[PDB]
């Protein structure tokens, strides 16, 4: 999907993701755009794998240096979006790191937590099972 | 449920059946009133006037 125009870089990319998603659901929009990081493409893919948001397209212009991603928001047949308001955990200046012994379960076994423990993005259940802890990236439920 | 002839100056988050029918332009509103009558007419097993014509009565308001 050709952009036909490059988006402008935010102060930080995860906050760009949050702002774009929240203003899309606020303005009744279905498509969101964000920068493309291996971390960020991984987090978007793992959000898709848990039924939170729709198709994602990674757009590379001429190199991995200029890479973005456009993803559609999931919309259930009841017109209710699966995105109940995304939040970031790896906050600049509020970087919260939880060990394997401190991996929580989102609102008592209802939501999904995104944890990059030691090798890549892992959901909450596999992170508990893998006996490996690490960074918690974002909360979507 | 609500059925209304929404206009572009109105809001579409208020009616349970949003239909883009203009009241400033009578060609939509007259047609819709006649067809709403005809729906319950054919529901009551009586002869039906419209809703099968390619172009019904031109009731253009001055």
């Amino acid at each position: 999907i050709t952009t036909t125009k490059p988006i402008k870089a935010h102060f930080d990319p995860v906050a760009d993701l949050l702002t774009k998603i929240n203003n899309a659901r606020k303005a009744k929009l279905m498509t969101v755009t964000t920068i493309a990081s291996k971390l960020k493409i991984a987090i978007l893919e793992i959000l898709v794998k848990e039924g939170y948001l729709a198709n994602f397209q990674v757009l590379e212009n001429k190199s991995k240096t200029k890479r973005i991603v456009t993803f559609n928001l999931k919309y259930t047949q009841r017109r209710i979006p699966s995105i109940n308001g995304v939040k970031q955990i790896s906050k600049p200046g509020l970087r919260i790191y939880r060990p394997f012994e401190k991996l929580p379960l989102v609102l008592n076994g209802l939501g999904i937590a995104i944890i990059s423990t030691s090798d890549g993005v892992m959901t909450d259940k596999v992170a508990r099972l893998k006996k490996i802890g690490g960074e918690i990236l974002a909360y979507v439920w | 449920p609500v059925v209304a002839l929404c206009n572009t100056n109105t809001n579409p988050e208020l009616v349970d059946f949003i239909i883009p029918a203009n009241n400033h332009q009578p060609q939509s509103t007259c047609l819709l009133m006649n067809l709403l009558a005809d729906a319950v007419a054919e529901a009551k097993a009586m002869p039906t006037m419209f809703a099968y014509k390619p172009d019904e009565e031109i009731q253009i308001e001055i």
């Binding site: 898709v48 994602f56 397209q57 757009l59 999931k74 919309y75 | 449920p1 059946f17």
Partner: peptide
């Protein structure tokens, strides 16, 4: 141009019908 594609998503057509039926 795109690089990935996964999980096609569709929804109902944009005409609200309350309860879908009243028969």
């Amino acid at each position: 141009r795109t690089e990935k594609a996964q999980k096609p998503k569709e929804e109902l057509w944009d005409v609200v019908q309350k309860m879908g039926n009243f028969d």
